[PDB]
Amino acid sequence: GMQEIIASVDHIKFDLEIAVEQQLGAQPLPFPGMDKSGAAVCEFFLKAACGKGGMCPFRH
């Protein structure tokens, strides 16, 4: 048993994981000063490819 070994997924690339990596459907953060909360760290900002600054829905 031990699901990770009998049913391995590491060879599978999920469209769901692609969406979070490329930030699909990342609407601009509304109400400037929203301060957000549970937003993840922006992957694009790490490699300096984030057009939105302060206006992005993700942490920078």
Partner 1 sequence: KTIDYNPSVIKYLENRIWQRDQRDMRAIQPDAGYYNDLVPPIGMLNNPMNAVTTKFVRTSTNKVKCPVFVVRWTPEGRRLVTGASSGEFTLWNGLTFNFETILQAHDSPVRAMTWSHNDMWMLTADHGGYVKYWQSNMNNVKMFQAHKEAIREASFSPTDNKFATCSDDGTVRIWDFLRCHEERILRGHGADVKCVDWHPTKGLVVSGSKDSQQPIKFWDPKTGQSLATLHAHKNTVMEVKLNLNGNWLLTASRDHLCKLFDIRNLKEELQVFRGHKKEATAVAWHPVHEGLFASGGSDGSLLFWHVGVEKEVGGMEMAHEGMIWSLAWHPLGHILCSGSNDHTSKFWTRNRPGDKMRDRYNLNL
Partner 2 sequence: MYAVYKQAHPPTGLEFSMYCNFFNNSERNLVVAGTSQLYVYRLNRDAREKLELAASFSFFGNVMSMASVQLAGAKRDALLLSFKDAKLSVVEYDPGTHDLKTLSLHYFEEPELRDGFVQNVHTPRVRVDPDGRCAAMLVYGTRLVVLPFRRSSFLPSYIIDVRALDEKLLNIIDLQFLHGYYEPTLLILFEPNQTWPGRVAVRQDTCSIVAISLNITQKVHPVIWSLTSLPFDCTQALAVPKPIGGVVVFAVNSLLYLNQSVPPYGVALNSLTTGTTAFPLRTQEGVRITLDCAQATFISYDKMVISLKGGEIYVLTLITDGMRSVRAFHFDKAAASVLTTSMVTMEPGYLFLGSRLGNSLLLKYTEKLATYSFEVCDSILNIGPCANAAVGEPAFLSEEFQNSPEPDLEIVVCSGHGKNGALSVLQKSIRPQVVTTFELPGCYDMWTVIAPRRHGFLILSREDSTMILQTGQEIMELDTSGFATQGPTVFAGNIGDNRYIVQVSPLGIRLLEGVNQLHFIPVDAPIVQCAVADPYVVIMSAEGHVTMFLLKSHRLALHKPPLHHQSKVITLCLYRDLSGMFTTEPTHWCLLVRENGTMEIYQLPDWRLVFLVKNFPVGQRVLVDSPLVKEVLLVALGSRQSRPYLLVHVDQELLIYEAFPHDGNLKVRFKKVPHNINFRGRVARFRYFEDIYGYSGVFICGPSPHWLLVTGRGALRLHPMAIDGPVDSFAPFHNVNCPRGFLYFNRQGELRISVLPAYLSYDAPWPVRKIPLRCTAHYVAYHVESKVYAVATSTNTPCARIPRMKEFETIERDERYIHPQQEAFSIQLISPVSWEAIPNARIELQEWEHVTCMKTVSLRSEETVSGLKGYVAAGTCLMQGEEVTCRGRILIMDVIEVVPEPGQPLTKNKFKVLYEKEQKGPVTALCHCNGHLVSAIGQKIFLWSLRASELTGMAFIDTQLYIHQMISVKNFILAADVMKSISLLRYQEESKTLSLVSRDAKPLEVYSVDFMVDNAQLGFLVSDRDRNLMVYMYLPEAKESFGGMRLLRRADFHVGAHVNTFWRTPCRVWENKHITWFATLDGGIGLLLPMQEKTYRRLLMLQNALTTMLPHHAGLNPRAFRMLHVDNAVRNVLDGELLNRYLYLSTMERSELAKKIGTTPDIILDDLLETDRVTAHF
Q: Does 50 bind Zn ion (CB under 5 A)?
A: yes
Site string for partner 2, 20-49 (x = CB under 8 A): x---xxxx----------xxxx--------
Q: Is the dihedral of CA 37, 41, 16, 55 positive or negative?
A: positive
Instruction: Give, as ranges, the residues between 7 and 36 that touch partner 1 (CB under 8 A).
Output: 30-31, 33-35
Question: Which residues have a Cβ under 8 Å from the Cβ of 29 and sit 6 or more positions away?
Answer: 36, 52, 55, 56, 57
C-alpha span between 57 and 40 (Å, rounded): 9
Query: Which residues sit at the interface with Zn ion, rule CB under 5 A?
Result: 42, 45, 50, 56, 58
Query: Which residues sit at the interface with partner 1, rule CB under 8 A?
Result: 30-31, 33-35, 37
